[PDB]
Scaffold this motif. Structure first.
Motif, PDB file in Angstrom:
ATOM      1  N   UNK A   1       0.997  -1.228   0.045  1.00 23.85           N
ATOM      2  CA  UNK A   1      -0.133   0.130  -0.054  1.00 23.85           C
ATOM      3  C   UNK A   1       0.757   1.170  -0.093  1.00 23.85           C
ATOM      4  N   UNK A   2       0.476   2.254  -0.587  1.00 25.36           N
ATOM      5  CA  UNK A   2       0.955   3.621  -0.357  1.00 25.36           C
ATOM      6  C   UNK A   2       0.722   4.007   0.972  1.00 25.36           C
ATOM      7  N   UNK A   3      -0.265   3.548   1.653  1.00 21.85           N
ATOM      8  CA  UNK A   3      -0.313   3.908   3.065  1.00 21.85           C
ATOM      9  C   UNK A   3       0.123   2.446   3.689  1.00 21.85           C
ATOM     10  N   UNK A   4       1.227   2.638   4.491  1.00 20.13           N
ATOM     11  CA  UNK A   4       1.618   1.587   5.124  1.00 20.13           C
ATOM     12  C   UNK A   4       2.475   1.906   6.690  1.00 20.13           C
ATOM     13  N   UNK A   5       2.349   1.216   7.476  1.00 22.16           N
ATOM     14  CA  UNK A   5       3.133   1.452   8.841  1.00 22.16           C
ATOM     15  C   UNK A   5       4.604   1.436   8.538  1.00 22.16           C
ATOM     16  N   UNK A   6       5.408   2.388   9.155  1.00 17.33           N
ATOM     17  CA  UNK A   6       6.783   2.512   9.152  1.00 17.33           C
ATOM     18  C   UNK A   6       7.479   1.847  10.093  1.00 17.33           C
ATOM     19  N   UNK A   7       8.622   1.035   9.646  1.00 13.86           N
ATOM     20  CA  UNK A   7       9.404   0.480  10.639  1.00 13.86           C
ATOM     21  C   UNK A   7      10.691   0.901  10.198  1.00 13.86           C
ATOM     22  N   UNK A   8      11.695   1.443  11.145  1.00 17.24           N
ATOM     23  CA  UNK A   8      12.710   2.139  10.812  1.00 17.24           C
ATOM     24  C   UNK A   8      13.642   1.314  10.086  1.00 17.24           C
ATOM     25  N   UNK A   9      13.814   0.095  10.308  1.00 19.69           N
ATOM     26  CA  UNK A   9      14.475  -1.014   9.665  1.00 19.69           C
ATOM     27  C   UNK A   9      14.050  -2.076   9.034  1.00 19.69           C
ATOM     28  N   UNK A  10      12.722  -2.423   9.044  1.00 17.04           N
ATOM     29  CA  UNK A  10      12.121  -3.279   8.192  1.00 17.04           C
ATOM     30  C   UNK A  10      10.899  -2.790   7.342  1.00 17.04           C
ATOM     31  N   UNK A  11      10.609  -3.139   6.393  1.00 17.39           N
ATOM     32  CA  UNK A  11       9.689  -3.055   5.413  1.00 17.39           C
ATOM     33  C   UNK A  11       8.537  -3.770   5.115  1.00 17.39           C
ATOM     34  N   UNK A  12       7.441  -3.979   5.275  1.00 17.15           N
ATOM     35  CA  UNK A  12       6.294  -5.083   4.725  1.00 17.15           C
ATOM     36  C   UNK A  12       6.555  -5.113   3.245  1.00 17.15           C
ATOM     37  N   UNK A  13       6.673  -6.345   2.731  1.00 17.97           N
ATOM     38  CA  UNK A  13       6.691  -6.539   0.940  1.00 17.97           C
ATOM     39  C   UNK A  13       5.882  -7.586   0.643  1.00 17.97           C
ATOM     40  N   UNK A  14       5.424  -7.271  -0.650  1.00 19.48           N
ATOM     41  CA  UNK A  14       4.683  -8.399  -1.451  1.00 19.48           C
ATOM     42  C   UNK A  14       5.978  -8.770  -2.811  1.00 19.48           C
TER      43      UNK A  14
END
Length: 387
Positions: free
Chosen positions: A359-372
């Motif tokens: 999503x264009x809107x997603x929760x932000x982790x300083x070092x980890x990003x959720x991905x498809x």
């Protein structure tokens, strides 16, 4: 499509809704968007949790069907009187249609106080419609009476901190794009898994990794007795064995810290001083879904910021508090709102498939990003479906 962006208000704990109107003259209602049921239904009488409702007597165009109806959900149930009427989505493509409407008369644990909706829109297929499969669901009606293509998509974004429930009604938390995809609401590639059969939006999960380690279960367990995608359900819900394994695994990853076991049952809360939530000690979860091609899967990866849902604290402080949003299920896997919030999700009814994208809107982790991410190779994916 731009007219449809931001047309959803609400949040994962109480549901996302869209404005619609019914009858002539148009009566405005907020209607909860639920991909886990197939019945369009409204409050048609006064009720303590309802600010307004549907007055058929005022409808110039309410027809009646002299038939009754009952729906039971995993939680809550209602009963009522089938009729038909003209329906519009003010955000939604400006074709008015005649649709089945249940007028709710009795209900138990169904309306939620403060949620600000007054009704529900089941976007799943007819076989699940009550009282039976000839009660054409809303979206079948919309496709059949207009030139709206046969898909819709959902970007749910929820729980910007710190959330206020009335305020959520005030400021937006998502988009339902009716009849297309809006390419500006996601990044990357759309990955598609087949809709296995057309009742609930049923998918097949073929692997599950936690912080990169495979749970090593028979993949049938992942879909026992079905896996589905459901905007109408808050949590990630897992079959009794899978759930036990995840929890065991998540507890171990976060063992340095102290939690009640009743937190892990999703009833109790947990709290940390503002901005000190130890996100890093909570693992990412990877659900690998069946792909469109032989022996091929893709994965979606979920951060703890989605499975730790923010809630307002009972002893009110400046704390960050969280209910655990993975719960045991005995009715199959349910990929609920909290999982959907990371992603742009395409319900491609026309090609019997479901698409996922960051999503264009997603929760932000300083070092980890959720991905498809794909493609992955995965042998014997058909086994994974339960029978």
């Amino acid at each position: 499509f731009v007219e449809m962006v931001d047309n959803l208000r609400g949040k994962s704990g109480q549901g996302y809704y869209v404005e619609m109107t019914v009858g002539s003259p148009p009566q405005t209602l907020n209607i909860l968007v639920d991909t886990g049921s197939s019945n369009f239904a409204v409050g048609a009488a006064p009720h303590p949790f309802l600010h307004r409702y549907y007055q058929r007597q005022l409808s110039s165009t309410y027809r009646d069907l002299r038939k009754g109806v009952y729906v039971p959900y995993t939680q809550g149930k209602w009963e009522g009187e089938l009729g038909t009427d003209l329906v519009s989505i003010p955000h939604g493509p400006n074709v008015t249609v005649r649709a089945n409407i249940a007028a709710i008369t009795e209900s138990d644990k169904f309306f939620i106080n403060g949620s600000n909706w007054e009704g529900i829109l089941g976007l799943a297929y007819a076989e699940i419609a009550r009282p039976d499969d000839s009660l054409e669901p809303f979206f079948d009606s919309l496709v059949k009476q207009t030139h709206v293509p046969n898909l819709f998509s959902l970007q749910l974004c929820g729980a910007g901190f710190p959330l206020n429930q009335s305020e959520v009604l005030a400021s937006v938390g998502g988009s339902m794009i009716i009849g297309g995809i809006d390419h500006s609401l996601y990044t990357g590639s759309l990955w598609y898994t087949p809709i296995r059969r057309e009742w609930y939006y049923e998918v097949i999960i073929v692997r599950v990794e936690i912080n990169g380690q495979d749970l090593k279960m028979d993949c049938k367990e992942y879909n026992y007795d079905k896996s589905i995608v459901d905007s109408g359900t808050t949590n990630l819900r897992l079959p009794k064995k899978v759930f036990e394994a995840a929890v065991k695994s998540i507890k171990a990853a976060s063992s340095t810290e102290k939690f009640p076991d009743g937190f892990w049952l999703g009833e109790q809360l947990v709290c940390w001083q503002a901005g000190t939530t130890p996100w890093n000690i909570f693992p990412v979860i990877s659900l690998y879904l069946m792909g469109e091609v032989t022996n091929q899967s893709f994965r979606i990866t979920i951060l703890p910021q989605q499975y730790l849902r923010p809630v307002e604290d009972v002893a009110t402080s400046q704390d960050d508090c969280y209910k655990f949003a993975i719960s045991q299920s005995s009715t199959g896997t349910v990929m609920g709102a909290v999982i959907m919030e990371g992603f742009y999700v395409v319900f491609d009814r026309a090609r019997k498939r479901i698409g996922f994208a960051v999503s264009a809107c997603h929760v932000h982790d300083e070092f980890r990003t959720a991905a498809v991410e794909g493609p992955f190779v995965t042998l014997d994916m058909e086994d994974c479906g339960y029978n």
